[PDB]
Amino acid sequence: DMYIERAGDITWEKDAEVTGNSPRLDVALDESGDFSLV
Amino acid sequence: GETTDGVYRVMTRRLLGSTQVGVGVMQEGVFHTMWHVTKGAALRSGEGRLDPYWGDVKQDLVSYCGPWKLDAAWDGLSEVQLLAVPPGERAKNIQTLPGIFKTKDGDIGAVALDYPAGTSGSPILDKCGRVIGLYGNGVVIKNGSYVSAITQGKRE
Numbered sequence: 001d002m003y004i005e006r007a008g009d010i011t012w013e014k015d016a017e018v019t020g021n022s023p024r025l026d027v028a029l030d031e032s033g034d035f036s037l038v
Numbered sequence: 039g040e041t042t043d044g045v046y047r048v049m050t051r052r053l054l055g056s057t058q059v060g061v062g063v064m065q066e067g068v069f070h071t072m073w074h075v076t077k078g079a080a081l082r083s084g085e086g087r088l089d090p091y092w093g094d095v096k097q098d099l100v101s102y103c104g105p106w107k108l109d110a111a112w113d114g115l116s117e118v119q120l121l122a123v124p125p126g127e128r129a130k131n132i133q134t135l136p137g138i139f140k141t142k143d144g145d146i147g148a149v150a151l152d153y154p155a156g157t158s159g160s161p162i163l164d165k166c167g168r169v170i171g172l173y174g175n176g177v178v179i180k181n182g183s184y185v186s187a188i189t190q191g192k193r194e
C-alpha cells in the first residue's frame with residue numbers, strides 16, 4: 001500500500017535558483033504514454 | 039485524512055524501507071499525480087483512503103477523489119518554476135525557461151532539468167503560483183540527461 005506525506009506549499013519563490021536550457025526536440029508519443037526522439 | 043492543498047510525496051513500503059515512488063498535488067479535495075507513479079492503485083492519507091477517479095496511460099495522468107482540477111497553461115514565453123520534491127530531500131523551487139517538444143499533434147512545453155525518477159509528479163508553476171503541469175514524462179537526450187514535458191490534464 002502506497003501513502004502520501006505533505007511536502008510543502010505551492011508558491012512561486014522570488015530569487016530562486018535559475019538553471020536549465022530550452023531545447024526544441026522532435027518527439028513522438030506512443031499508446032503507452034512513452035516519448036521517443038525522431 | 040489530510041486533504042490540505044499543497045505538494046505531497048508518494049511513498050511505498052513494498053520495497054526495502056520507505057521508498058519515494060513519486061510526487062503529487064492536492065487541490066480542491068483532489069490528488070493529482072502521474073499514472074506511472076501509482077499505476078491507478080489506491081493511496082492512503084493517514085487513517086483515510088484515496089480512491090482513483092480518472093486516469094489515462096497515454097496522457098500519463100491520474101486524479102483521486104474527484105476530476106482533474108488543474109487547468110493553467112504555459113504562456114509559451116515566460117520562465118516557470120519546477121517545485122522539485124526529490125527522494126529524501128526537501129522541496130525546492132528551480133526557475134527555468136522551458137524548451138519545446140515538437141509532435142505530430144502540435145507542440146508541448148519542456149523543462150530541461152534532470153532529477154531522480156521518484157521526483158515524477160512534481161508541479162511546474164507560473165509566476166502566479168498556478169500549476170501549469172507535472173514533471174516526470176519525457177525523453178532521454180544524447181547527453182544522458184532527462185527533458186520532461188510540461189504535462190497538463192483537462193478540467194471538465
Ligand SMILES: O=C(Nc1ccc2c(c1)CNC2)c1cc(Br)cc2[nH]c(=O)[nH]c12
Nearest residue numbers: 033034074153154155157158174175184
Ligand atoms: O522514467 C521516467 N518517467 C516515466 C516512467 C514510466 C512511464 C512514463 C514516464 C510514461 N509511461 C510510463 C523518468 C522520470 C523522471 Br522525473 C526522470 C527520469 N530519468 C529517467 O531516465 N527516466 C525518468
